[model samples]
Target: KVFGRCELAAAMKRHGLDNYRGYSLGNWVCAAKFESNFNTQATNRNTDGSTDYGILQINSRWWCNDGRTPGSRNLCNIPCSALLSSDITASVNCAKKIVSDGNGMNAWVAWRNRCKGTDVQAWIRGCRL
Candidate 1:
């Protein structure tokens, strides 16, 4: 599911992501937009044969198991599909986990490439919540 900006914003707010883990919600929103265009079913294969999955485009290599055969650290202990749902429950929790023990949004390449050092408040404009 590709959530409309307003709908996604509302879900993020409810997930405590407005400022969760010290990263601005701006970072989260920008990453989501760029990573998967907010499409929950988005998937991409890396040159290394690992795949990225879901709205946040979490990598199977380090974050979760795509399959035992595909190889993974299972660090986030999630199924790749869980992140691909319209439901924000698992996706937000896992993303928050990613932010918890790192240089914040630096964990995501898209955020660094596109979201950093920019005016991010625009991502939430007209959402009004």
Candidate 2:
């Protein structure tokens, strides 16, 4: 089945990623909602000749060799997009590892604080499933 905004949200929830780290799922969805209305096949070329593709607006040339084709192999090694076609848990775990290098939750907390905003506590308060 094709994944939409609700599916995307569910995927995120399954992965335990509730907050947006700079360009987290929430921010990605918000951008997609406004830009392409969450179309998974959305594509547009930037002025710099880069192309954004798929649900999370992943750049084709930057992330994959397939260039906008669904189910393309993840060449860029981006865990988030790699999980897009596979398991959300794996994706989230990969992201967590990248974010926190086996440290406690410091990476996540740091990202939430730095990328999200200075008001980490308040920002976390609003982060809901």
Candidate 3:
């Protein structure tokens, strides 16, 4: 879950993040910072009792499941636990789905409230890439 800056960037690149929605690397970095601080093991319980998973905090209500975990509608057809694993392939794919089908960056509340329209350079500044 602990990713150095360069390491995280490499993973994102390899995760492919297919169907690039025109958001920059900085946008992704900013979202990850707010969502999970790059922690793969992160999980958060929404006020409505649904849990969010992985770097993007994809919600159980619409994205993934943890089997017995409640509120999982599993639109991504993958377990929330899988999303939390070190392998981020599933998480990135699901997030791409969100950006494609949902409201771009607006699909993520953190990006909407904090990242949108802001100067994103700070998120990736000085990184080796």
Candidate 4:
């Protein structure tokens, strides 16, 4: 499903992403907007032939196993198809793991480019936490 701003906020909040790993709800909401526009089925193919999956755009490079990304680590240890489902818990869980990585949320270039070092309050302004 394509979630609205507040809709996605509520979802993320329900899953405890509000302040996970010191990243605010605003940061996550902003990342979702730029990553996949809150679309559960979003996918992007990189030039290296790896694919980014789902709303957070979890990469096949080291997360979900797409079975085609060369040298894939499948760190999340799940099928790439799991991220495409309307039930976003799988994607959310995987995103948390990504944030726990050494690079933190910097694993997503979109977040660094669009949400880093900025006021993202507007992203969750009406979400009511």
Best by lDDT: 4
Writing each residue's lDDT as its tens digit, candidate 3 over 2-103 gives 666567766786676422788877788788888889898888888877888888899888888766556457788987888888878888889888888857
Clashing pairs in 2: none
* Tens digits of per-residue lDDT for model 4, 34-128: 99999999999999999999989999988989889878789888999999998889999999998998888898899999999999888988666
RMSD of each: 1.3, 8.0, 2.0, 0.9
Tens-digit lDDT string for candidate 1 (1-129): 998887888889889998887767777888899999999999999888788888888888888887842655878888888888879788888888888866788988999999999998889888868
Cand. 4 Cα-lDDT: 0.91
Question: What are the per-residue Cα lDDT tens digits for candidate 2 across 1-129?
Answer: 245666656566566665634334453334335444545555566565555544444544445444444454554466334434534444345444444434433333323444343333332234444
The TM-score values for the models, in the order shown, are 0.93, 0.43, 0.88, 0.96
Whole-model Cα lDDT per candidate? 0.84, 0.46, 0.80, 0.91
The superposed Cα distance between candidate 3 and the true structure at residue 29, in angstroms, equals: 0.7
Backbone clashes, each candidate: 0, 0, 1, 0
Candidate 2's displacement at residue 93, Å, is 9.0
User: Order of candidates by lDDT, top first?
Assistant: 4, 1, 3, 2
Task: Name model 4 segments beyond 4 Å from true.
Answer: none
Cα-based lDDT at residue 109, candidate 3: 91
